Structure 1
Amino acid sequence: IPGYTYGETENRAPFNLEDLKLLKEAVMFTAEDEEYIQKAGEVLEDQVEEILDTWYGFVGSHPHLLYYFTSPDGTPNEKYLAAVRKRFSRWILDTSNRSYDQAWLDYQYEIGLRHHRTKKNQTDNVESVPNIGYRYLVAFIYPITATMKPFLARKGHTPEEVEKMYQAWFKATTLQVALWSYPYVKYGDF
């Protein structure tokens, strides 16, 4: 997967496992959510293309959101969209599969950097807009969480298990966006 450097950034994030413990406590993420986000694994594995169709559909239907993938001339950069799509697809699996350990935190830092002007457009060597305004990362917690529910509900598991998977996904999405604020936030205010 071009540009995907999980576990090999060779850069230790400015947050550690103690920070993560406290952040998990604030978002109410426990061992129960680890169990159920992992069960979401097998459920979502075969559906990732349809999930990305939904998410890219949402972005593409809103000029002010599609903006973030545009070339200077205002048209969508198709190379950029396609390359990011492969990494975004993989993130769905990583969220369900990966242990949230230091390697995971180091990639969280990287993902935040890539939305921020610090590293945006470098991974794919594209010319596009310099920064994704942080307000929209937070806003996206809702669509990224809520649009996942129909996909969780399809694989013939109990509605009770689906609800637990869904709450785990909401917490995990929130947790990650909180971490991605680091490069946006004034030093010492994070």
Structure 2
Amino acid sequence: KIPGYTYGETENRAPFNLEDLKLLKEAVMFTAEDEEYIQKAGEVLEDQVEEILDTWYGFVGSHPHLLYYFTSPDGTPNEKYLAAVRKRFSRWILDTSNRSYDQAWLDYQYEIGLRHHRTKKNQTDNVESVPNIGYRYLVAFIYPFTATMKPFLARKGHTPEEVEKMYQAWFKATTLQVALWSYPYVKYGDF
């Protein structure tokens, strides 16, 4: 098992439903054409995942104000936290590419947003760390995550158009997901 990973077992039901989902997917231009390529993207990404996270944490860990979010109260990086989160992140990359975007998925998007927000942050791994990830970086992270991703989508031998649609499906998925994760951060009624 992957510790802390509780997909389909949140227990706890999302405040947004499947109609909300249809409507947000439309805002983000996500169609059945995108579900083909997001999963195609899975195949291309599966065995590259370790190297992706190395480029990811290499970006986080090269900025103090972002590494911050992984630190012990003494301002040193919690190595256990980093490594515990790394694994669920790994699994998310795959989930995005493999789960059906349904009630359970939605329930876990609620979960994940709660884990970034002060509501649930740090309870999953029983670490002591910063209480809240300020929402501004969640939005901002949309850029580096998407953009780091692009080379990795090519590397496994794919024709610019194959890569551009995989990329775009990934861009939309990320945006969509983040948008959903904003729920706990937003003043009630403004979501």
Q: Could you tell which deviates more after superposition, 156-165 or 32-41?
A: 156-165
Greater displacement, 18-27 / 152-161: 152-161
Q: Distance in 1 between matches of 2:106 and 2:153?
A: 25
1:161 Cα deviation from its structure 2 partner: 0.8
Q: SS of the residue aligned with 1:117?
A: coil
- Hey, what's the Cα distance between the residues in 2 that align with 1:60 and 1:174? 23
* Post-superposition offset of 1:90: 0.6
Cα distance per residue 1:1-20 (max 9 Å; x no partner): 00000111122100011000
TM-aligned CA deviation for residue 159 of structure 1:
1.6
What whole-Å deviation, never above 9, does each CA across 1:62-85 have from its counterpart, x for those lacking one? 000000000000000000000000
Does 1:103 pair with 2:104?
A: yes
Where in structure 1 do 4 or more consecutive aligned residues deviate above 6 Å? none
Q: Distance in 2 between matches of 1:53 and 1:80?
A: 15
In the TM superposition, what are the counterparts of 1:76-115 in structure 2 within 5 Å?
76-115=77-116
Identical positions, percent: 99
Q: Compute the displacement of 1:48 (Å).
A: 0.4
Deviation at 1:151, TM superposition (A): 0.3
Q: Deviations over 1:17-40 (max 9, x none)?
A: 100000000000000000000100
Q: Summarize deviations over 1:127-177 as a string: whole Å, max 9, x none.
A: 000000000000000001011000000111222111000000000000000
Corresponding position of 1:177:
178
Q: What is the CA distance between 1:87 and its match in structure 2?
A: 0.4
Separation in 1, partners of 2:120, 2:9? 16
Give the distance between the partners of 1:109 and 1:182, measured in 2 at CA.
Answer: 7
**Structure 1 residue 187: deviation in Å?**
0.4
Range with greater deviation from structure 2 (151-160 or 60-69): 151-160
CA RMSD of aligned residues (A): 0.5
**Segment of structure 1 superposing worse, 157-166 or 57-66:** 157-166
Deviations for 1:95-149, whole angstroms, at most 9, x for unmatched residues? 1111111110000000000000000000000000000000000000000101100
Q: Distance in 2 between matches of 1:119 and 1:4?
A: 13
Partner Cα distance (2:24, 2:46) in 1 = 27
Runs of 5+ unmatched residues, structure 2: none
Alpha-carbon distance between aligned partners in 1 of 2:153 and 2:115, rounded to the nearest angstrom: 28
Q: Take 1:66 and 1:117, find their aligned partners in 2: how far apart are those partners?
A: 17
Q: Partners of 2:98 and 2:47 in 1: how far apart?
A: 14
SS at match of 1:5: coil
Q: TM-score, length-normalised on structure 2?
A: 0.98
Bigger Cα displacement from structure 2, 153-162 vs 13-22: 153-162
The equivalent of 1:154 in structure 2 is: 155
SS in structure 2 of the partner of residue 183 of structure 1: helix
CA apart distance, 1:54: 0.6
